[PDB]
Write a protein that binds this ligand. Sequence first.
Ligand SMILES: [Mg+2]
Ligand SMILES: [Mg+2]
Ligand SMILES: [Mg+2]
Ligand SMILES: [Mg+2]
Lengths: 178, 176
Amino acid sequence: IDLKTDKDFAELPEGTLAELLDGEIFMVPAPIPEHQRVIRKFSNALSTFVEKNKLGEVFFSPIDVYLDEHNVVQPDLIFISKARNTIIREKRIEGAPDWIAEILSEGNAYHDLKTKKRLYEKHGVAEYWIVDPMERSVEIYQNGNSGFTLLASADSGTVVSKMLDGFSLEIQTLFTKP
Amino acid sequence: DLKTDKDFAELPEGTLAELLDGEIFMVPAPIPEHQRVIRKFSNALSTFVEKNKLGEVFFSPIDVYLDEHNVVQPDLIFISKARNTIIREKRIEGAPDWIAEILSEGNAYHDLKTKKRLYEKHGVAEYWIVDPMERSVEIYQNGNSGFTLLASADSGTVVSKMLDGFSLEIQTLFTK
Ligand SMILES: [Mg+2]
Ligand SMILES: [Mg+2]
Ligand SMILES: [Mg+2]
Ligand SMILES: [Mg+2]
């Protein structure tokens, strides 16, 4: 009866990084450098492939993605196809991206693993990558007529996208350092 | 009554802010065009750094501690292998070799002035200021007398001094 809405989410004080999940507002903790390293490496690989094949647009956090009145999320890495370009608005994304990756944080992984997995499934995100920098592993889910099914789960070798035909990723290169 | 990095560390979870000259400023959330410019710049820079095995690139949000009265969240940073030890578990402790800030209309003063002085003082060797409203770039080179203007352009290609061989066609950062 007291669900928070996108209007409540918009009224948060300037300088607040939060997400609205199932009508509840959650503060997101500041990420640590290793989390940012992984997003940088993933975005570089994804952006290069998207740009070479003119597939659409890549964004990374912070960026608001409105899904419905009770759900506004800030995914780590998103891809929006040319066909769905109109969901990119002046101040946020309005509608589900085609493709999302979340990079886990040890103290805040439940929403990536459970709550947003269901949300992204419901709203038709076609492919969802969950990257775990603590286990140095990836899980890939593909959407379909019966929701998400596990496409790949690995901490070694190469994983390939299904919806981004030709995109592959050598998993251990997400986590390496000088 | 100056705020310190101890006060900064005690801001409530979910707060993204900067500590500048001992005063805490909230940073407004960025808009998609800002994030698009960082994505384009990060891709170009990261490709070059990786190709040449030069160090590490990070983009915001990331805390960069400079001294007890200054903790910044720069948009894009490069840390050479030579300065590799400033990468800590929860933040950067010390000045990156290289920084780019992407201006926002309502919040540009700190990038243009306040942080320009701080990055100069703390030994950032090269500082790029990218303005997506005017679609322009300014590049500052540090030196024994502080920053000097290496380049100011809104067309053509600009060349980095400290990233030897890195160049950027300026209008590829921007939307027409
Ligand atoms: Mg998150
Ligand atoms: Mg994350
Ligand atoms: Mg800023
Ligand atoms: Mg900025």
